[PDB]
């Protein structure tokens, strides 16, 4: 394990947060595991959508975005996925990160605090300047 | 660093071209350009035109992603998310919406229906092997 | 005077057929992934089904492969990728499988050879958290 290129990102624990900040499973992971921080159990009925808090807020540096993506095993095993995927967190969004889950499986599913519910991948984006034309 | 992208208004476009909300925004809001109101009933999938076509430079893609508010409040999201626009796609950008909520929802022209984030992609050269 | 590429090791599994995933043109962002199920698979309306592709890859560090929906399949049949965008990184060396869901109006048969998803390779960044009380 040698040198590594990182981007430093400010993050705040809110009152409902427990445990560690979002972690990369390994040194080779593209995404950090987001963890449910709802104080009381949340049931997602078949077909229903529920917003799940994470208890963290971040301030991304300019030109970097955080993508909220589905955790694959949850979709494969329970049909649980991220209803607004991929979620876009940019430097403007400094409120609590919340994961919008939908139950597209065949059984009701309970979200409990501590459950891994989504992945967060940080990447660069570009800024477009439009050049309007009548011929493409 | 800013990238210039050619954009064409088609006959059905209105208002200003897709805009970044602020200097820190990752994406531009895509706006519905349907001439008549479109109802997306529960479970239905509907293609919404935007009235624009773009010509991306090589190595750049535009990603069509859901707007958070429509999904949180109405279960409306982008059915083929994220949509991939690249330098080959020079036709009209259309947003494929699905209603996974519990109430019918009307798409009106002028409504913000998706986000467009431009990013770089890398071109893969495969190295075939029997041993990973 | 060249284009920029990233070289990625790829292994064909026994069920793979045809050429390695291809870019449609020199200007394409993604490669077409092809169904590699040996027998037809029916995806009933509302059902979710994992479709194998017959490949495994070894991405270099800080590169990911995104598994994204193929637009025509969603527009015409309501078939899309249920865990989209799928994230393949350097740790995943198993067979790539596409998780499809049928949100259309008709049961749909996935046949071997069908294009079922797009694969776009991009860089990601590694976050170092800086914890603070004021954002």
Contact A75, A37 (CB under 8 A): no
- Bond prior to B29 in cis (omega within 30° of 0): no
What's the rounded Cα separation, in Å, for the pair C38 and C42? Answer: 13
Q: B6 pairs with which residues across the strands? A: A131, B55
When CB atoms are compared, the residue of A25, A32, A85 closest to C127 is A32
Determine the distance in angstroms separating the CA of B85 from the nearest CA of chain C, rounded to an integer: 8
Exposed e or buried b for every residue in C8-18, given b needs 16+ CB within 10 A? Answer: bbbbbeeebee
Q: CB of C75 within 8 Å of any CB in chain B?
A: yes
Closest C-alpha among C92, C30, C84, C106 to residue A104: C84
Q: Output phi, psi for A74, to 5 deg.
A: -65, -45
Cβ–Cβ below 8 Å for B24 and A127 = no
Tokens 């409120």, residue?
A95
Cβ–Cβ below 8 Å for B132 and C57 = yes
Judging contacts by C-beta atoms under 8 Å, the chain B residues touching residue A62 are 23-24
- Tokens (6 digits) for C110: 């996935």
Q: How many CA atoms lie within 13 A of A103 on its CB side?
A: 17
Closest C-alpha among C39, C5, C21, C28 to residue C96: C21
Q: How do the domains of chain B map onto residue ranges?
A: 1-132
Contact B115, B66 (CB under 8 A): yes
Scanning every residue of chain C, which has its alpha carbon at the shortest distance from the alpha carbon of A84?
C84
Q: How large is the greatest C-alpha to C-alpha distance in chain A, in angstroms?
A: 57
Determine the distance in angstroms separating the CA of A37 from the nearest CA of chain C, rounded to an integer: 18
Residue A12 vs residues A59, A87, A89, C36: alpha-carbon distances, Å? 9, 19, 15, 45
Residue A68 vs residues A31, C38, C40, C108: alpha-carbon distances, Å? 9, 33, 33, 29
Residue A38 vs residues B108, C30, C87, C119, C120: alpha-carbon distances, Å? 35, 37, 26, 34, 34
DSSP string, A18-85: -SPSPEESSTT-SEEEEE---SS-EEE-TT-EEEEE-SEEEEPPTTEEEEEE--HHHHHHH-EEETTP
Scanning every residue of chain B, which has its alpha carbon at the shortest distance from the alpha carbon of A125?
B119
Contact C8, C23 (CB under 8 A): no
When CB atoms are compared, the residue of C25, C84, C121 closest to B124 is C121
Exposed e or buried b for every residue in B99-129, given b needs 16+ CB within 10 A? Answer: bbbeeebebebebebbbbbbbbbbbbebeee
What's the rounded Cα separation, in Å, for the pair C118 and C22? Answer: 10
Neighbours of chain A (3+ CB pairs under 8 A): B, C
Q: C97 pairs with which residues across the strands? A: C52
Q: For residue A133, how many other CB atoms are within 10 A of its CB? A: 12
Tokens 């975005």, residue?
A65
Q: Residue B90 carries which DSSP code?
A: -
Closest C-alpha among B89, B63, C124 to residue A128: B63
Q: For residue A45, how many other CB atoms are within 10 A of its CB? A: 11
Residue C116 vs residues A81, C39, C77: alpha-carbon distances, Å? 19, 15, 12
Q: CB of B47 within 8 Å of any CB in chain C?
A: yes
What's the rounded Cα separation, in Å, for the pair B54 and A121? Answer: 27
Chosen for mutation from C95, C99, C120, C127 (greatest number of chain A CBs closer than 10 Å) is C127
Exposed e or buried b for every residue in C54-91, given b needs 16+ CB within 10 A? Answer: bbbbbbeebbbbbbbbbbebbbebbbbbbbbbbbbbbe
Residue C110 vs residues B44, C23, C51, C76: alpha-carbon distances, Å? 22, 21, 8, 14
Contact B5, B56 (CB under 8 A): yes
**Residues 6+ positions from B119 with CB-CB distance below 8 Å:** A123, A124, A125, A126, B60, B61, B63, C122
Phi/psi-derived region of residue A55, left when phi > 0, alpha when psi is between -120 and 50, beta in every other case: left
What's the burial of A12, exposed, middle or buried (CB within 10 Å: 0-12/13-18/19+)?
A: middle
Q: Residue C111 carries which DSSP code?
A: P
Q: CB of A24 within 8 Å of any CB in chain B?
A: no
For strands A127-132 and B2-9, give the pairing.
parallel
**Residues 6+ positions from C3 with CB-CB distance below 8 Å:** B58, B123, C26
Q: CB of A77 within 8 Å of any CB in chain C?
A: no
Q: How many CA atoms lie within 13 A of A84 on its CB side?
A: 27
Q: CB of B58 within 8 Å of any CB in chain C?
A: yes
Scanning every residue of chain B, which has its alpha carbon at the shortest distance from the alpha carbon of C24?
B88
Q: CB of B1 within 8 Å of any CB in chain A?
A: yes
Measured between its terminal Cα atoms, the distance across chain C in Å is 44
For this entry, resolution in Å reads 2.2
C83 among the known binding-site residues?
yes
H-state helical runs in C10-90: 71-77
Phi/psi-derived region of residue A53, left when phi > 0, alpha when psi is between -120 and 50, beta in every other case: beta
- Tokens (6 digits) for B37: 């109101």
The binding site of A for substrate consists of 71-73, 84, 88-90, 98
Degrees, nearest 5: CA angle B119-C53-C83:
50
Method: X-ray
Residue C119 vs residues B59, B94, C31: alpha-carbon distances, Å? 15, 21, 5
What's the rounded Cα separation, in Å, for the pair A63 and B74? Answer: 30
Closest C-alpha among C121, A88, C113 to residue B66: A88
Strands lying side by side in the sheet with A6-13: A56-59, A6-13, C126-131
B107 among the known binding-site residues?
no
Closest C-alpha among B37, C81, B28 to residue A69: C81
Q: C57 pairs with which residues across the strands? A: C10
- Bond prior to A86 in cis (omega within 30° of 0): yes
Q: How many CA atoms lie within 13 A of C31 on its CB side?
A: 17
**Residues 6+ positions from C93 with CB-CB distance below 8 Å:** B132, C56, C57, C58
* Interface A-C: count of C-beta contacts within 8 A: 109
- Tokens (6 digits) for C36: 């590699």
């Amino acid at each position: 394990p040698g040198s590594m290129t990182i981007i430093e990102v400010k993050i705040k624990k809110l009152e409902n947060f427990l445990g560690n900040l979002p972690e990369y499973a390994t040194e080779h992971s593209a995404g950090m595991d987001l963890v449910a921080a709802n104080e009381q159990s949340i049931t997602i009925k078949v077909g229903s959508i529920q917003l799940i808090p994470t208890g963290i807020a971040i301030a991304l540096p300019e030109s970097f975005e955080a993508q909220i993506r589905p955790r694959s095993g949850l979709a494969v095993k329970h049909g649980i996925t991220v209803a607004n995927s991929p979620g876009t967190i940019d430097a403007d969004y400094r409120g609590e990160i919340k994961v919008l889950l939908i139950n597209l499986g065949n059984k009701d599913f309970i979200i409990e605090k501590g459950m891994r519910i989504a992945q967060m991948i940080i990447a660069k984006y570009e800024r477009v300047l439009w050049a309007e034309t009548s011929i493409l």
